[PDB]
Amino acid sequence: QLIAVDEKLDITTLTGVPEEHIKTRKVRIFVPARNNMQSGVNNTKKWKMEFDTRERWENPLMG
Amino acid sequence: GVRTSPTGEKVTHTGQAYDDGDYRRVRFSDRQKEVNENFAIDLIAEQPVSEVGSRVISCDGGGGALGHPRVYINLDKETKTGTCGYCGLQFRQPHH
Amino acid sequence: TYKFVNMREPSMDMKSVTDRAAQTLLWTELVRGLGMTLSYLFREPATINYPFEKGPLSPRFRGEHALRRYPSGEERCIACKLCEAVCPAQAITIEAEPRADGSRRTTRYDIDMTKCIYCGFCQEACPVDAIVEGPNFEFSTETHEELLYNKEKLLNNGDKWEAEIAANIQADYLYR
Amino acid sequence: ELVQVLRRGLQQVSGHGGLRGYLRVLFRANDVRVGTLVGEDKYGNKYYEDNKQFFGRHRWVIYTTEMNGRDTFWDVDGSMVPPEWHRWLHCMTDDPPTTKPPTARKYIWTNHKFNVSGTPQQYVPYSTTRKKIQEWVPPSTPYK
Amino acid sequence: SNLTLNFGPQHPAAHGVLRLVMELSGEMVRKCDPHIGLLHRGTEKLIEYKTYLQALPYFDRLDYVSMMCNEQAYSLAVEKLLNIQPPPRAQWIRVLFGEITRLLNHIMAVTTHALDIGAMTPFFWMFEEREKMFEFYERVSGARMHAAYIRPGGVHQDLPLGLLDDIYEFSKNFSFRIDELEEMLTNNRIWRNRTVDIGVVTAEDALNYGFSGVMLRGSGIQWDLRKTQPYDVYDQVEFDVPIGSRGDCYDRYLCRVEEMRQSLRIISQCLNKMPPGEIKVDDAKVSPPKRAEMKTSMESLIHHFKLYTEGYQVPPGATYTAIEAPKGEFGVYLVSDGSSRPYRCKIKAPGFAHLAGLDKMSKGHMLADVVAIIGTQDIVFGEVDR
Amino acid sequence: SRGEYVVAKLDDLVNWARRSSLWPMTFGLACCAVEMMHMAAPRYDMDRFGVVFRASPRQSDVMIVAGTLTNKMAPALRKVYDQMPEPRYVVSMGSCANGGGYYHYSYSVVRGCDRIVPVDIYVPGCPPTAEALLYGILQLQRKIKREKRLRIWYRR
Amino acid sequence: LHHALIPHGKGGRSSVSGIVATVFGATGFLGRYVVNHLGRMGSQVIVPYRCEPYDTMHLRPMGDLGQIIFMEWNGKDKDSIRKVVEHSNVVINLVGREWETKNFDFEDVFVKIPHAIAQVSKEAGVEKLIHISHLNADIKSPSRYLRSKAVGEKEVRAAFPEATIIKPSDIFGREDRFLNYFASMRWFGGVPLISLGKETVKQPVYIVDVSKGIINAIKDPDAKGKTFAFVGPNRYLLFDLVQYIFAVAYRPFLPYPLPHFAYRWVGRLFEVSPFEPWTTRDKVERVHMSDMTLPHLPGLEDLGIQATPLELKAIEVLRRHRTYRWLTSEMEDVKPAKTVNI
Amino acid sequence: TRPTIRPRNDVVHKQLSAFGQYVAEILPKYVQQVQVSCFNELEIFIHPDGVIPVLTFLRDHTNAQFKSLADLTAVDVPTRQNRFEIVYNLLSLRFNSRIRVKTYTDELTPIESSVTVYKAANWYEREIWDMFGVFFANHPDLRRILTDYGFEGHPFRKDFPLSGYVELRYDDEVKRVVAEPVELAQEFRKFDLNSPWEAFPAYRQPPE
Amino acid sequence: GTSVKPIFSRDMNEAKRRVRELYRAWYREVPNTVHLFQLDISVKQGRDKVREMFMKNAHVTDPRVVDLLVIKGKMELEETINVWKQRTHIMRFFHETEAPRPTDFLSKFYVGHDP
Ligand SMILES: CCCCCCCCCCCCCCCCC[C@@H](O)O[C@H](CO[C@H](O)CCCCCCCCCCCCCCC)COP(=O)(O)OCC[N+](C)(C)C
Ligand SMILES: NC(=O)C1=CN([C@@H]2O[C@H](COP(=O)(O)OP(=O)(O)OC[C@H]3O[C@@H](n4cnc5c(N)ncnc54)[C@H](OP(=O)(O)O)[C@@H]3O)[C@@H](O)[C@H]2O)C=CC1
Ligand code: SF4
Ligand code: SF4
Ligand code: SF4
Ligand SMILES: [Zn+2]
């Protein structure tokens, strides 16, 4: 038998992601732009979801 | 073609050398810095320019299949030699 | 087509029962095993006298990496980054720029030998036989940092092992 | 037959340069076999062959007692073999560098070096690239 | 209250990374609970980030006792998805080295089982033959175990000019080594007492519990993938399938010894019937061209570039490809989405199902019996844990 | 001096006894242990160097980390290392134990066993050959020969 | 700030903290904790060592690749000091011994070596210097240890005027000589105490608190030329403290009074050991001396450190000294000791 | 077309199509689709409520006799409302055949455990729960099998990062192994390998 | 009816009762965990940690999510009781080694770029 949950879907507590990477993250949903160097359009069919760029630094060893 | 930095550190062929105030030199204390002594730019500069009697020459780096992909060099400019894009060897037509 | 491995029953002859009883009481199979061990004791051992003797190898052997040169002394590498793209372990890091003479040459060529799986895909991908897997295998270090190779170390390895690398390549490039 | 193997042992003792040489090779290499001298190294290593031993014991090297800077009477290791004899000794080829010398190049090391780990000559990694971002330099003159 | 014991991971009989939680009444084993994942490396997720060529060495490292067989299974799956066919000489080379790999794995399994039970001597006798086969591997590829020789279009390189003779020399002598092993173990009453009627599994329980390979054939089930669903050239070689009668450790030991003999037979047949020709598919959009062509031909250079940077694309689809690996049925469920990277790769290893049934086989047995049962299942945890 | 000569001789004797009797723990994780098994095989015969495997960590002098170290296994490796009586040594065998190797970016793999235990010798390869591991073991012996415990104690 | 030293990352193992620290005496009790804290944030740590390199193995897993560099040094050689402090912006001095060897006395490890370190660091361009003294250091104490401590403290201040001086008191931890010292005298039947330990007051401090205070003083701009006292939150009588120590270890406590001269004589007898002495006359003097109270000095709470009471950390040190019967006993079962607080 | 192209087998294709029609006819209540691939593999897509019936049929019917469970696994497709896809691979020794049964579920809907039909499923289902978080109802012992103790999250999900969230190291202050937020000396270098040109015209999708 | 089937509970009341059962089991287990694992924490500290872990998911309103959370908590307790976990796993709940990340704007601005 069915129980008729009428709430908003929220699986946040089940994914095991740290709360820092849930509340302070901003995602971008977009169709990627065509690479202007080529005329092919096969990479502009699907939607992509990506995350905001964070800090990258240089390793003290090997750089 | 190694040269010495003002701090006394050997300079690599890429030109890298830590400055005087750089703490990262401490990794070379009680040890050494690895610098390759044979500089490819200086070594390729010693090769004589090859005189050929054709407008277009071919280069594969020598050794046949043991070299690089075969390419064709135009030699129509008289003020500059033709350089291989893989090997660095220089070719020219008889001038003067 | 199949065969049975353990579907044999033994004869019930009086003499056969006697042999089985003698085997049970006098341990003939165990004597046979002792005889096998004794025969092995008098054979010549297979041990080799390392390090004065070495195990056999092949020209195809994959070991410590090296960067090679043309006979003129110019580096073979042209920074196409095919080895970097093919590396299954992402163990290669490459940075390049136009050289002072305009040649297309690397400024950084790093191989993390603690990431490398020694598959040899890099030397198969390389179009100019620049990066190779050498014949050396005795290069254990005392620290982790010594196994993070940069371009200077790899060029030194090439200069050190070229006399053997070139000869190994000569014997196998017709299979490639 | 037993007297023949005893004679062979006595011949092994005699052929190493007397009792002193026999003891030296016995305590250094843990082996007293005698083979034909294939060649002598630039650094003092000697390379011997004997085709009657089985595959793996038919080629060997007696290492030098004095490599680049260290005393290798007791402390020897496989990294002391130069690359040409490295190819011969590991059975990658049947041709010794004495009969089939390698090609000469101006950039090839004229002096082989062993594994220098744990010594002041060890390799230390570093970034070979130049600085990416250049910072603004304030003027040396006062502004007011 | 029963005694609770940690068996492994640091235990000689634990095969490295097994944590067997055992509940014992005295020395009787009341319950076995295998904790695994101590060698879980997340191989499938990593494969999802590589191209099809880049994912091949993972299959080498899966079952590190049977390397060419894992390569062959992955290659067969990718070839089925690509709708290409390897050349005949490549198929004969694949079957030859698969039989050599079967010999290597069976040596390892039998000798380690004997060492666990207590017979320490045949291990040293047979690991010299293992060393010679490692030499064959290294001569053909340059690596003693992790060859990556078998590729999804054929094989990487051709055999060196003197390899077949050396393989024949090894094979004409390996039978006496098997004979010495059997003299050591087959009729020994201590060995039989340790193995007879130990870990007995019925045919129906073996089928339901997902068993395969020897674990099936020891119970009398007449099944073998090389006979029922042959893949490379196995329909052109004649060999016999050993069948057990009692379903215990002794029958499985006998089956493995006879399978070594049959692998020798197949190796002889492959040596005689090796054909000439090319070694990889003559399709430069899948297999790389030769180095001489790449340095002379524009198309060859372009295809070399694109194959070693992006890789070939595989048409969208999903396949399940299984082979008779030396440890059982080794399978790959491979899902492609039209790209040059696999969408999903699920690895089916016989060790997973065989270890999931260790508790069933160990009922009413002692600690040493459980050691024997672990030995008889031929478990390598690289494939169990993935 | 006279005391320094005596402590030097005692140092030599102790180092020789320690390096000539190296007992590794019977400990292996993955593919590399197989090559380790080939070092005990008749061709190389590590026994002839004074090297024998012993199961109990209390009766071991060296630990060889031969294989991948996962996050699940790391506490067990640390535990069996801590129960080793001193002096003790660690040899890292292969890329996975060295720095993670082919699984360096995995979620469940420790990026190098030197994050868990201190390491004396790093043997590179995937897997290192039995000759490479033999070279590493002899290098560890040469390192043990170089240690000066009583000389340093006498100069305190 | 020399761009190569600009902090980067989230303060983890692979981050850059901007600290290049030469830690003298890093192979000691406090040195391991200091190096651990420095390597946690991703600092370049330079370890000068004079012992056998084996005795430094435990310091190797404490930093990322290349972040811990071990160099040999000699205490009496200033060239070695210059070599090890040339490229550092912080120098920490943790050199010290609780006994005098035939090569180094109390004024060699507490006056000469600290002064040489401070002078070479000042002339090598080092920006920050951290020097560890004792809380009870003064030039008129019966203990030569503390007199040398005070002389060396003032000499270090003279050589490096903007140095940070930290004066802890009886650090307790897993590898200490405070709790372990009192727990180990159970093997002598009774516990000898001067005047039954009823006229001595101790204020021990947690080792982690001291290491955190040192790390915080490194990155505190205002702590350039100040002097800190690192003491615990509670002051105990010596008798009560030892009784609590034996109660946590679950050992029978049989104290007895011993006159000062007899205890000094047993200390002199134990001093003859060519190895590390079990106890010395100086150790006896320091054990039975009350802790000074210096309220005018800044403390741990001025560096943001809340001192951890002994009650929450005594079990982690004293559980090793229990027998199998009492090995699993919990922490709150031992009835915390009486405190002489104000 | 002979040398480099994999040959076809129409007989097996016809047999598999006939048996797929047979199975669809016998079980109309649960069977939603039947397919045969170009390399002769039979696939049956069923409603999630038919896991126990269909499998039982395929194991016990005289004409099916799919006695062996070769493999059971899940596939994560985030773009679908029912995120997870459950795949059963079965082998019939009597008829020398292989079949595949596929169903679907999401993060909150349990799937009925098939341990009663196949014992081999017991671990596989556990693995699915460990790697994807799909709950199996009426499982005799459902717990983590592959991941570390106390591991949070399900790694085989597509939104789970490759290197995870935490990493392990030994800490000497606490004298034990500790977990910290993950930090990488070298970040994994993502490669954009897809070509901007179509490869297979036969699989082109309508342009909406 | 939204066409959703339950795991165990049909409404929030049954889910709450299951939560209370799991909480009781954890509260009873805490002293045994402290004794067996030889932890240097008090029973009160462990019980407060259990309370914090339970309150971290106090905002859930879906009975299915509460059911899955209770199932995961039951597996965690079963891991703890059978000594499958080690002291390291149990002490990972406390983050003793991790340096506390400041939460106010100025400290975040001083240390770096992360919000
Ligand atoms: C009295 C009870 C306590 C002491 C017990 C002593 C028992 C007898 C002593 C044992 C004698 C053996 C020691 C010397 C053997 C070394 C052999 C030689 O080859 O060593 C070389 C170097 O010599 C050693 O360094 C010297 C070790 C001992 C130095 C002097 C001995 C001092 C003995 C004094 C004992 C008195 C104590 C009294 C206590 C009351 C280097 O060899 P090495 O290369 O590595 O190994 C071979 C590998 N190969 C193949 C590459 C060659
Ligand atoms: N522990 C305590 O109760 C408190 C400590 N004190 C002070 O705190 C400092 C560190 O304390 P702690 O860690 O416990 O002391 P330790 O005895 O544990 O370690 C002393 C360190 O100093 C080095 N060292 C000692 N003597 C010399 C020397 N002659 N030459 C070179 N190095 C030497 C040691 O190196 P090596 O291992 O090679 O000998 C060692 O690394 C010390 O200066 C001490 O005086 C302050 C109040 C009390
Ligand atoms: S051998 Fe393989 S893993 Fe190593 S650098 Fe080359 S491609 Fe990468
Ligand atoms: S080594 Fe070869 S493949 Fe790699 S960048 Fe250089 S030329 Fe290209
Ligand atoms: S280094 Fe290679 S062979 Fe060794 S355990 Fe890791 S993957 Fe296996
Ligand atoms: Zn050219």
Side-chain angles (χ1 to χ4, degrees), chain C residues 29-55:
Chain C
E29 61 201 6
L30 313 168
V31 174
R32 256 162 102 92
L34 290 177
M36 202 64 224
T37 288
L38 181 71
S39 76
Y40 256 89
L41 176 94
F42 287 106
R43 301 175 191 196
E44 170 156 11
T47 309
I48 75 178
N49 198 16
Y50 188 81
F52 312 91
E53 300 166 329
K54 316 310 226 83

CSV table of all heavy atoms in Angstrom, one decimal, chain C residues 29-55:
chain,number,residue,atom,x,y,z
C,29,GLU,N,53.8,-45.6,0.7
C,29,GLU,CA,53.7,-44.3,0.0
C,29,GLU,C,54.5,-43.2,0.7
C,29,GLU,O,55.1,-42.4,0.0
C,29,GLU,CB,52.2,-44.0,0.0
C,29,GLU,CG,51.6,-43.8,1.4
C,29,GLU,CD,50.1,-43.9,1.5
C,29,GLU,OE1,49.5,-44.3,0.4
C,29,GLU,OE2,49.5,-43.7,2.5
C,30,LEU,N,54.6,-43.3,2.0
C,30,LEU,CA,55.4,-42.3,2.7
C,30,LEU,C,56.9,-42.5,2.3
C,30,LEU,O,57.7,-41.5,2.2
C,30,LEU,CB,55.2,-42.3,4.2
C,30,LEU,CG,53.7,-42.4,4.5
C,30,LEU,CD1,53.5,-42.8,6.0
C,30,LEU,CD2,53.0,-41.1,4.2
C,31,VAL,N,57.3,-43.7,2.2
C,31,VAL,CA,58.7,-44.0,1.7
C,31,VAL,C,58.9,-43.5,0.3
C,31,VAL,O,60.0,-42.9,0.0
C,31,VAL,CB,59.0,-45.5,1.9
C,31,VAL,CG1,60.4,-45.8,1.3
C,31,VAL,CG2,59.0,-45.9,3.3
C,32,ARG,N,57.9,-43.6,-0.5
C,32,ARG,CA,58.0,-43.0,-1.9
C,32,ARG,C,58.2,-41.5,-1.9
C,32,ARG,O,59.0,-41.0,-2.6
C,32,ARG,CB,56.8,-43.4,-2.7
C,32,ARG,CG,57.0,-44.5,-3.7
C,32,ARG,CD,55.7,-45.1,-4.1
C,32,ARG,NE,55.3,-44.7,-5.5
C,32,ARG,CZ,55.6,-45.3,-6.6
C,32,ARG,NH1,56.3,-46.4,-6.6
C,32,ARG,NH2,55.2,-44.7,-7.8
C,33,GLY,N,57.4,-40.8,-1.0
C,33,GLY,CA,57.6,-39.4,-0.9
C,33,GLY,C,58.9,-39.0,-0.4
C,33,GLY,O,59.6,-38.0,-0.8
C,34,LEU,N,59.4,-39.7,0.6
C,34,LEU,CA,60.8,-39.5,1.1
C,34,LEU,C,61.8,-39.7,0.0
C,34,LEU,O,62.8,-39.0,-0.1
C,34,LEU,CB,61.1,-40.4,2.3
C,34,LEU,CG,60.4,-40.2,3.6
C,34,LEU,CD1,60.8,-41.2,4.7
C,34,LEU,CD2,60.7,-38.8,4.2
C,35,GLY,N,61.6,-40.7,-0.8
C,35,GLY,CA,62.5,-40.9,-1.9
C,35,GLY,C,62.5,-39.8,-2.9
C,35,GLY,O,63.5,-39.4,-3.5
C,36,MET,N,61.3,-39.2,-3.2
C,36,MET,CA,61.2,-38.0,-4.1
C,36,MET,C,62.0,-36.9,-3.5
C,36,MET,O,62.8,-36.2,-4.2
C,36,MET,CB,59.8,-37.6,-4.3
C,36,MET,CG,59.6,-36.8,-5.6
C,36,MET,SD,60.0,-37.9,-7.0
C,36,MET,CE,61.0,-36.7,-7.9
C,37,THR,N,61.9,-36.6,-2.2
C,37,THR,CA,62.6,-35.6,-1.5
C,37,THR,C,64.1,-35.8,-1.6
C,37,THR,O,64.9,-34.9,-1.9
C,37,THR,CB,62.2,-35.4,-0.1
C,37,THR,OG1,60.9,-34.7,-0.1
C,37,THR,CG2,63.2,-34.5,0.7
C,38,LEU,N,64.5,-37.1,-1.4
C,38,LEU,CA,65.9,-37.5,-1.4
C,38,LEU,C,66.5,-37.3,-2.8
C,38,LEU,O,67.7,-36.8,-3.0
C,38,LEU,CB,66.1,-38.9,-1.0
C,38,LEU,CG,67.6,-39.4,-0.9
C,38,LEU,CD1,68.3,-38.8,0.2
C,38,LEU,CD2,67.5,-40.9,-0.8
C,39,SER,N,65.8,-37.6,-3.9
C,39,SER,CA,66.2,-37.4,-5.2
C,39,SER,C,66.4,-36.0,-5.5
C,39,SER,O,67.3,-35.6,-6.2
C,39,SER,CB,65.3,-38.1,-6.2
C,39,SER,OG,64.1,-37.3,-6.4
C,40,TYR,N,65.5,-35.1,-5.0
C,40,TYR,CA,65.7,-33.7,-5.2
C,40,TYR,C,66.9,-33.1,-4.4
C,40,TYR,O,67.5,-32.2,-4.8
C,40,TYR,CB,64.4,-32.9,-4.7
C,40,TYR,CG,63.6,-32.5,-5.9
C,40,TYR,CD1,62.6,-33.3,-6.4
C,40,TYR,CD2,63.8,-31.2,-6.5
C,40,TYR,CE1,61.8,-32.8,-7.5
C,40,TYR,CE2,63.0,-30.8,-7.5
C,40,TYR,CZ,62.0,-31.6,-8.0
C,40,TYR,OH,61.2,-31.1,-9.1
C,41,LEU,N,67.2,-33.8,-3.3
C,41,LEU,CA,68.4,-33.3,-2.5
C,41,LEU,C,69.7,-33.4,-3.3
C,41,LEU,O,70.6,-32.6,-3.1
C,41,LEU,CB,68.5,-34.1,-1.2
C,41,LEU,CG,69.7,-33.8,-0.3
C,41,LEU,CD1,69.4,-32.7,0.7
C,41,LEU,CD2,70.3,-35.0,0.3
C,42,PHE,N,69.8,-34.4,-4.2
C,42,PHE,CA,71.1,-34.6,-4.9
C,42,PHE,C,71.1,-33.9,-6.3
C,42,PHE,O,72.0,-34.1,-7.0
C,42,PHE,CB,71.3,-36.1,-5.0
C,42,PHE,CG,71.7,-36.7,-3.8
C,42,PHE,CD1,70.8,-37.5,-3.1
C,42,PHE,CD2,73.0,-36.5,-3.2
C,42,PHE,CE1,71.2,-38.1,-1.9
C,42,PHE,CE2,73.4,-37.1,-2.1
C,42,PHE,CZ,72.5,-37.9,-1.4
C,43,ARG,N,70.1,-33.1,-6.6
C,43,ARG,CA,70.0,-32.4,-7.8
C,43,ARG,C,70.8,-31.0,-7.6
C,43,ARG,O,70.9,-30.6,-6.5
C,43,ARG,CB,68.6,-32.1,-8.3
C,43,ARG,CG,67.8,-33.3,-8.6
C,43,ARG,CD,66.4,-33.0,-8.9
C,43,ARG,NE,65.5,-34.1,-9.0
C,43,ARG,CZ,64.3,-34.1,-9.5
C,43,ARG,NH1,63.8,-33.0,-10.1
C,43,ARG,NH2,63.6,-35.2,-9.5
C,44,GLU,N,71.2,-30.4,-8.7
C,44,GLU,CA,71.8,-29.1,-8.7
C,44,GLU,C,70.7,-28.0,-8.4
C,44,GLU,O,69.7,-28.0,-9.1
C,44,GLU,CB,72.5,-28.8,-10.0
C,44,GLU,CG,73.0,-27.4,-10.1
C,44,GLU,CD,74.2,-27.2,-11.0
C,44,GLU,OE1,74.5,-28.2,-11.7
C,44,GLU,OE2,74.8,-26.1,-11.0
C,45,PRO,N,70.9,-27.2,-7.4
C,45,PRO,CA,69.9,-26.1,-7.1
C,45,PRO,C,69.9,-25.1,-8.3
C,45,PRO,O,70.8,-24.9,-9.0
C,45,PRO,CB,70.4,-25.5,-5.8
C,45,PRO,CG,71.9,-25.8,-5.8
C,45,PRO,CD,72.1,-27.1,-6.5
C,46,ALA,N,68.7,-24.4,-8.3
C,46,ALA,CA,68.4,-23.4,-9.3
C,46,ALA,C,68.8,-22.0,-8.9
C,46,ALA,O,68.6,-21.1,-9.7
C,46,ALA,CB,66.9,-23.4,-9.7
C,47,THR,N,69.5,-21.9,-7.8
C,47,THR,CA,69.8,-20.5,-7.3
C,47,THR,C,70.9,-19.9,-8.1
C,47,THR,O,71.9,-20.6,-8.5
C,47,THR,CB,70.2,-20.6,-5.8
C,47,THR,OG1,69.3,-21.4,-5.1
C,47,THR,CG2,70.4,-19.3,-5.2
C,48,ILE,N,70.8,-18.6,-8.3
C,48,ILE,CA,71.8,-17.8,-9.0
C,48,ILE,C,72.5,-16.9,-8.0
C,48,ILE,O,71.9,-16.6,-6.9
C,48,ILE,CB,71.2,-17.0,-10.2
C,48,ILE,CG1,70.4,-15.8,-9.6
C,48,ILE,CG2,70.3,-17.8,-11.0
C,48,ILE,CD1,69.9,-14.9,-10.7
C,49,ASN,N,73.7,-16.5,-8.3
C,49,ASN,CA,74.5,-15.8,-7.3
C,49,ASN,C,74.4,-14.3,-7.5
C,49,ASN,O,75.3,-13.6,-7.9
C,49,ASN,CB,76.0,-16.2,-7.4
C,49,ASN,CG,76.8,-15.9,-6.2
C,49,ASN,OD1,76.3,-15.6,-5.2
C,49,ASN,ND2,78.1,-15.9,-6.4
C,50,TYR,N,73.2,-13.8,-7.1
C,50,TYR,CA,73.0,-12.3,-7.1
C,50,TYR,C,73.8,-11.7,-6.0
C,50,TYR,O,73.9,-12.2,-4.9
C,50,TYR,CB,71.5,-12.0,-6.9
C,50,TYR,CG,71.2,-10.6,-7.0
C,50,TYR,CD1,70.9,-10.0,-8.3
C,50,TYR,CD2,71.1,-9.7,-5.9
C,50,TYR,CE1,70.7,-8.7,-8.4
C,50,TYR,CE2,70.8,-8.4,-6.0
C,50,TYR,CZ,70.6,-7.9,-7.3
C,50,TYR,OH,70.3,-6.5,-7.4
C,51,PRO,N,74.4,-10.5,-6.3
C,51,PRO,CA,74.3,-9.7,-7.5
C,51,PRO,C,75.4,-10.0,-8.5
C,51,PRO,O,75.4,-9.3,-9.6
C,51,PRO,CB,74.5,-8.3,-6.9
C,51,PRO,CG,75.5,-8.5,-5.8
C,51,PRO,CD,75.2,-9.8,-5.2
C,52,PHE,N,76.2,-11.0,-8.3
C,52,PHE,CA,77.3,-11.3,-9.3
C,52,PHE,C,76.7,-12.0,-10.5
C,52,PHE,O,77.3,-12.0,-11.6
C,52,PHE,CB,78.3,-12.2,-8.6
C,52,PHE,CG,78.8,-11.6,-7.3
C,52,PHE,CD1,78.2,-12.0,-6.1
C,52,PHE,CD2,79.8,-10.7,-7.3
C,52,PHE,CE1,78.6,-11.5,-4.9
C,52,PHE,CE2,80.3,-10.2,-6.1
C,52,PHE,CZ,79.7,-10.5,-4.9
C,53,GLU,N,75.5,-12.6,-10.4
C,53,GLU,CA,74.8,-13.1,-11.6
C,53,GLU,C,73.4,-12.5,-11.6
C,53,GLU,O,72.8,-12.3,-10.5
C,53,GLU,CB,74.7,-14.7,-11.5
C,53,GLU,CG,76.0,-15.4,-11.5
C,53,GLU,CD,75.9,-16.8,-11.1
C,53,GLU,OE1,75.0,-17.2,-10.4
C,53,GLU,OE2,76.8,-17.6,-11.6
C,54,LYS,N,72.8,-12.3,-12.8
C,54,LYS,CA,71.6,-11.7,-13.0
C,54,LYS,C,70.6,-12.6,-13.7
C,54,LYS,O,71.0,-13.4,-14.5
C,54,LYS,CB,71.7,-10.3,-13.7
C,54,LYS,CG,72.8,-9.4,-13.3
C,54,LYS,CD,72.8,-9.2,-11.8
C,54,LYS,CE,73.0,-7.8,-11.4
C,54,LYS,NZ,71.7,-7.1,-11.5
C,55,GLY,N,69.3,-12.4,-13.4
C,55,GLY,CA,68.3,-13.1,-14.2
C,55,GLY,C,68.2,-12.6,-15.6
C,55,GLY,O,68.5,-11.4,-15.9
